Design a protein around this ligand. Structure first.
Ligand SMILES: Nc1ncnc2c1ncn2[C@@H]1O[C@H](COP(=O)(O)OP(=O)(O)OP(=O)(O)O)[C@@H](O)[C@H]1O
Ligand SMILES: Nc1ncnc2c1ncn2[C@@H]1O[C@H](COP(=O)(O)OP(=O)(O)O)[C@@H](O)[C@H]1O
Ligand SMILES: Nc1ncnc2c1ncn2[C@@H]1O[C@H](COP(=O)(O)OP(=O)(O)O)[C@@H](O)[C@H]1O
Ligand SMILES: [Mg+2]
Ligand SMILES: [Mg+2]
Lengths: 486, 469, 467
């Protein structure tokens, strides 16, 4: 009998096989059970091995024979995945046939060092005004989306994914962005409706949906983010730009906690092992922006975190808040009073900042940020409204208009030039003489008008990437003329 | 095979075998019991020992007793014969009318529909309840949750939903009662018999009750959900028909696992819950789904321990529902019944495309006015309400009117309120809330809207109050 | 001697020697890795086994791999060739620029200088920054908290301190980026190269960067502070000079220690922090002192968890801080740089005995007048400006002028302001504030003081702005 390349299960239960033998098994190696089940060897102990089963332990008896595959976990990669729905290991689950990817990568590779990177400078357009202007996201960033239940996080992610269609359908090649959506611990029907939604917007020809749903064993939910991040590192390391969305990163932590507590590792705070920082840091540190010597590609990341009762001092929310280059709060109090997307712009930040905004959006959002900052510190008076001087009155009459410009609807991202035009109209002052309730209508009208007649001006803003004083004057004329006839 | 008991600790029994070993989830029958005791295998500890959870009280077990491996997981009767009956976790009847004689048996453990088998259609399911239909419309084939503290209206609301929908349903129905009062189980059984839904004489029953009430040891409360779910699975697949599945409560399915966890040798998780809470619940909630080969309109009541919606159990369940109606204790204190919280109940079909532009605009208007009222109450606390401006006294008055109008009298609450239960089709709700928002009822007192159906009834009640004044 | 990896549980590796064990804290080299994996010993389990914490990923470790006992704790190169070079906890260079060539090697687990070596006179490090040197003076061989997050001038202030201390004292600086974001680490490296503190060509760099990145096992983020301390201790003992030691962040140090302790299997303390929090902080913080050869002055960026100043981490840290500097956004908005908040910033040596009577009295005068102006700002915002006495208006003028005078131009932020940088010596700052307070300059305009060095330069500006 062989007890180096083969072993036999001493015990099983709750998904943690205890194997005896496998003396040559490496740590974090993929062994295979006699029942066609795979597993990952996590605990190497003097007397046994702790294997986490990728599936149901109903099929793992005691005394079964386990054979080591000799390789660390690896996943397929390539543009052969684009438009598919794969599971935590590359297996297709959309029933469109095999995947047919030549290459492979290791899920647990290390991030690029300090020299390969270069400072984040390109803008990653999310097509959401509140984000693209006030909390911008560059390429190579890691911008946490942290919020409560049903506040609109997945919708922010899907608007971002849908927006890139305008770039991916063009001919410019350094603006193309390929999206990956890792869906962790989600009802399968949610992922199915999401894939349908992406197909509707035709945004599923450059998207890879990695699916680790609720029924999946804990190791698959633990492993889905790394599978997605490897499929994204493939595009990063080939001069292409990627955007990976983990949704959520709290359920990966829960699955990891389950495996640890079943392997009997010292609990720690909230029963989370001591590796729930290392676990997330060594994942989120793979979002980079390689310099030209390494291809110039990049890989953005938008981890999604759910916070219970707006408690952002919990364990995992703070672990992932101290790792990332910003955060987009989504408060529900604002969600229900009309502000949708409910991006609290007080708590939201982007440590990258305006270094990742197009010169036009810099030109405009630079002053929009200050106008809203001033409004937010006299917001309380809004109820009293009267009994106050013209100074604060004008402050909170500009703030209300600016706020109502940032409202936006499901699955309808706006091109950067149109966001710039709308915010220009709003902040330069061509709206302070308008009843707030009508502002949205004006927007939804003005936008369309500009889209129809003045396409040349929008083209010039888009290409020049700046509001030249000639374009500035033309835009002022357009706004004045339209606002006159409203 | 045949093993022998070796240790009994609480509801956890270890059994040692000498023949082959029984795989996990198998059911082992203990030999020498007056009533069938079934142990469901749960762990292999090595040395041909298995740790198991007894589905029924382990009183009077003896070390060395003999245990026979049935050879397959708990198998339960299924088919159109279980309609009108009552079943244990192990499927044997508990309504004293003889055996459930079926052709079909099903194992209560079975994988979930694959991703290639899901449906993606959504059509509103009118329930006749103003708040539920307006702010958080349900959906045919969707999973629905009622998150409540203790004594807020979960059970009365689920009885109202049964009465309404199950009676007017072409397909079958199932009510799995997991670990809640036995008084309530008997009450429901008699209510159905007296309402024709169940029928003792002939084969015309549309409900297949299953009960694991709170006197069952934890091994049983943690499985009866799977048993009711298996009956619903069959009706969904083999009958190829629509199904309803009311579960009450789905917290006890987690609580029982927590109860047995420590004795199984597991380090406890955050709040004393088992480390496997999330997956032990996903493997269940992922079988309650519509598919291309059927449809289940599952409704589930969910205890929220101490009204703490951030507890791990409700917090984890929130992700498995297509629509949640968070009953609230604060609203129930104001006397508004149902207590549904308008600013916490959500849905997935509340979109301008799935329910229409006007419905969506009205729902969002209701939510926004209530939120504005919430903000105003802080000021009203200090200034008094006479100091409020005249654009806000209107807001407060309208918000109070809407709060009252969201209440409604159910047909199953006639014992409490005395009023007559009403159903408000969707059009009346949308029209009435449109009118209340527009200002077409600033001249009626707010109490005119308390516990009435359509808006015209509020007008009539206002007239009657005026006359009797 | 060679042992054999017997167990591998996460980042904790149990090795089994057969001839003789290595004392605790030694470094062991695992044989068979493409990279260099170093395990630091942590326990002596008995039966010749030692439990150890890995400095790198422990993926791919077989049960039986040979492990060579190095023979002493982690040893790094501590020559003067480190300056301008990035290195990681085990001392390898992580800037892919070639090996760090030095003739000296230092073991990172040292002990605090004995009681006899301690210096007893409490001096005052002169950073050359007016606000830092007047209201919250820094002390040689003292710990200095640095509050304020991003967007306020933390990196520019760090670079200015590095430059001034390397210029007005000849003493180098070390930057131990514990738990350092790779993006932020690269940005800091390039900002330094641009600003001249690091120089890639002419061997005149004033900074030694050490980076324990955020994606390294906890065993490596809890030791990088000791690598920084080792380099700085070399510059203090074997070159007898003053040193700056920046630690960004000091919270991530305690957190890394906490994770390591949890991994080893120790009962977590009060709020989940390791039981050894006090002495883990003490062993590190107690090597930053002014012995009889030189001094290490540590500037420790501090994060306060949950805005809770009594949390065990900051509570343990603040027992060691000898001063505090509070960068505040509300003063970057007003255009005053550095953003140092003159009132939140405090210091232990604001004591007439330590700094002197004239320095002390000037500092208290400035604090009193600024407090008074803060109080009067509310009344000006409520009852109007016209209802203030002559003395109140005079104090408002003095306070605005002092505010503007605290601002200074930094030689490293020239590309922002364009103004040539200044290094204000202590005595000049005291003179300028004495004069401004006594009223000698009641006859000058506010903007004459914005972004100027000595006071005489403010007078020159006042003249040139009326000609
Ligand atoms: N920009 C928006 N405008 C209008 N409604 C929105 C917007 N974003 C989200 N919503 C609404 O909020 C609800 C919840 O959206 P979403 O699923 O994005 O939140 P979530 O945080 O992903 O939910 P969960 O936490 O349950 O996954 C949806 O019904 C959607 O209609
Ligand atoms: N629609 C209603 N009308 C009047 N009273 C109600 C209504 N719903 C609940 N109540 C009151 O609140 C109590 C809550 O009990 P119930 O909802 O049956 O159990 P649970 O604690 O599961 O919610 C009821 O006994 C009843 O007195
Ligand atoms: N003395 C100063 N002169 C001019 N600009 C400054 C000064 N101090 C800070 N700033 C500005 O404040 C910004 C803050 O960025 P920096 O301090 O470099 O990084 P961090 O915000 O991480 O500390 C800088 O971009 C800089 O332009
Ligand atoms: Mg979501
Ligand atoms: Mg109940």
């Amino acid at each position: 009998v062989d007890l180096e390349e083969t072993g036999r299960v001493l015990s099983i239960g709750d998904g943690i096989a205890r194997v005896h033998g496998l003396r040559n098994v490496q740590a974090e190696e993929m062994v295979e059970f006699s029942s066609g089940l795979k597993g990952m060897s996590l605990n190497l102990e003097p007397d046994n091995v702790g294997v986490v089963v990728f599936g149901n332990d109903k099929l793992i008896k005691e005394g079964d024979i386990v054979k080591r595959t000799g390789a660390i976990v690896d996943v397929p990669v390539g543009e052969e995945l684009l438009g598919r729905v794969v599971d935590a290991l590359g297996n297709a689950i959309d029933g469109k046939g095999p995947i047919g990817s030549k290459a492979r990568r290791r899920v647990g590779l290390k991030a690029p060092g300090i020299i390969p990177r270069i400072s984040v400078r390109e803008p990653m357009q999310t097509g959401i005004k509140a984000v693209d202007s006030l909390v911008p996201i560059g390429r190579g960033q890691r911008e946490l989306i942290i919020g409560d239940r049903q506040t609109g996080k997945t919708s922010i992610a899907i608007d971002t994914i849908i927006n890139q269609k305008r770039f991916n359908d063009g001919t410019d090649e350094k603006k193309k962005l390929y999206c990956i959506y890792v869906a962790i611990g989600q009802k399968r029907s949610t992922v199915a409706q999401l894939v349908k939604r992406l197909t509707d917007a035709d945004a599923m020809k450059y998207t890879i949906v990695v699916s680790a749903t609720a029924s999946d064993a804990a190791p698959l939910q633990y492993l889905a983010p790394y599978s997605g991040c490897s499929m994204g590192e493939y595009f990063r390391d080939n001069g292409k730009h990627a955007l990976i969305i983990y949704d959520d990163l709290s359920k990966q932590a829960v699955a990891y906690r389950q495996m640890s507590l079943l392997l009997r590792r010292p609990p720690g705070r909230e029963a989370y092992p001591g590796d729930v920082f290392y676990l997330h840091s060594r994942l989120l540190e793979r979002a980079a922006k390689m310099n030209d010597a390494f291809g110039g590609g990049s890989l953005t990341a938008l981890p999604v975190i759910e916070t219970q009762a707006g408690d952002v001092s919990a364990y995992i929310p703070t672990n992932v808040i101290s790792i990332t280059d910003g955060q987009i709060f989504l408060e529900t109090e604002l969600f229900y009073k009309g502000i949708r997307p409910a991006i609290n712009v007080g708590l939201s930040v982007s440590r990258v900042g305006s270094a990742a905004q197009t010169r036009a959006m810099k030109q405009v959002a630079g002053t929009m940020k200050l106008e809203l900052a001033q409004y937010r510190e006299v917001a309380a008076f809004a109820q009293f409204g009267s009994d106050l001087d013209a100074a604060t009155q004008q402050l909170l009459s500009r703030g209300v208009r600016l706020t109502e410009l940032l409202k936006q609807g499901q699955y309808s991202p706006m091109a950067i030039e149109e966001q710039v035009a709308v915010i220009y109209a709003g902040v330069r002052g061509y709206l302070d003489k308008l009843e707030p309730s009508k502002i949205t209508k004006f927007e939804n009208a003005f936008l369309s008008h500009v889209i129809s007649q003045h396409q040349a001006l929008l083209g010039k803003i888009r290409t020049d990437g700046k509001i030249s004083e000639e374009s500035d004057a033309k835009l002022k004329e357009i706004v004045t003329n339209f606002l006159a006839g409203f | 095979t045949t093993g022998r008991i070796v240790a009994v600790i609480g509801a956890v029994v270890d059994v040692q075998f000498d023949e082959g070993l029984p795989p996990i989830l198998n059911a082992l029958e203990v030999q020498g019991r007056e009533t069938r005791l079934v142990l469901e295998v749960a762990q292999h500890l090595g040395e041909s020992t298995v740790r198991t959870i007894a589905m029924d009280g382990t009183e009077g077990l003896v070390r060395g007793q003999k245990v026979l491996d049935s050879g397959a997981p708990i198998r339960i009767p299924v088919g159109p014969e279980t309609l009108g009956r009552i079943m244990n976790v192990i499927g044997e009847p508990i309504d004293e009318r003889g055996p459930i004689k079926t052709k079909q048996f099903a194992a209560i453990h079975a994988e979930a529909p694959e991703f290639v088998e899901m449906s993606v259609e959504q059509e509103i399911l009118v329930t006749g309840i103003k708040v539920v239909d307006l702010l958080a419309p349900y959906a045919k084939g969707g999973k629905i949750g009622l998150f409540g503290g203790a004594g807020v209206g979960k059970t009365v609301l689920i009885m109202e939903l049964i009465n309404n929908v199950a009676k007017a349903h072409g397909g079958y129905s199932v009510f799995a009662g997991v670990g809640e009062r036995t008084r309530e189980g008997n009450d429901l059984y008699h209510e159905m018999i007296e309402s024709g839904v169940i029928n003792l004489k002939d084969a015309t029953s549309k409900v297949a009750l299953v009960y694991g009430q709170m006197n069952e040891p934890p091994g049983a409360r943690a499985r009866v959900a799977l048993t009711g779910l298996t009956v619903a699975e069959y009706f969904r697949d083999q009958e190829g028909q629509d199904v309803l599945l009311f579960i009450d409560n789905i917290f006890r399915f987690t609580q029982a696992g927590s109860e047995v966890s420590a004795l199984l040798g597991r380090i406890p998780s955050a709040v004393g819950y088992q480390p496997t809470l999330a997956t032990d619940m996903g493997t269940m909630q992922e079988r309650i789904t519509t598919t291309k080969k059927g449809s289940i309109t599952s409704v589930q009541a969910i205890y929220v321990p101490a009204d703490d919606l951030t507890d791990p159990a409700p917090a984890t369940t929130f992700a498995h529902l297509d629509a949640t109606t968070v009953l609230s204790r604060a609203i129930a204190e104001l006397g508004i019944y149902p207590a549904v919280d308008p600013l916490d109940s959500t849905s997935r079909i509340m979109d301008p495309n799935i329910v229409g532009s006007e419905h969506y605009d009205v729902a969002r208007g209701v939510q926004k006015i209530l939120q504005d009222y919430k903000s105003l109450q802080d000021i009203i606390a200090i200034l008094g309400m006479d100091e409020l401006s005249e654009e806000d006294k209107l807001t407060v008055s309208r918000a109070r009117k809407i709060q009252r109008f969201l209440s409604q009298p159910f047909q199953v609450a006639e014992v409490f309120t005395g009023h007559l239960g009403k159903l408000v089709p969707l059009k009346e709700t949308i029209k009435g809330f449109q009118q209340i928002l527009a200002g077409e009822y600033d001249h009626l007192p707010e109490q005119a809207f308390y516990m009435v159906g359509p808006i015209e009834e509020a007008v009539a009640k206002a007239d009657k109050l005026a006359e009797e004044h």
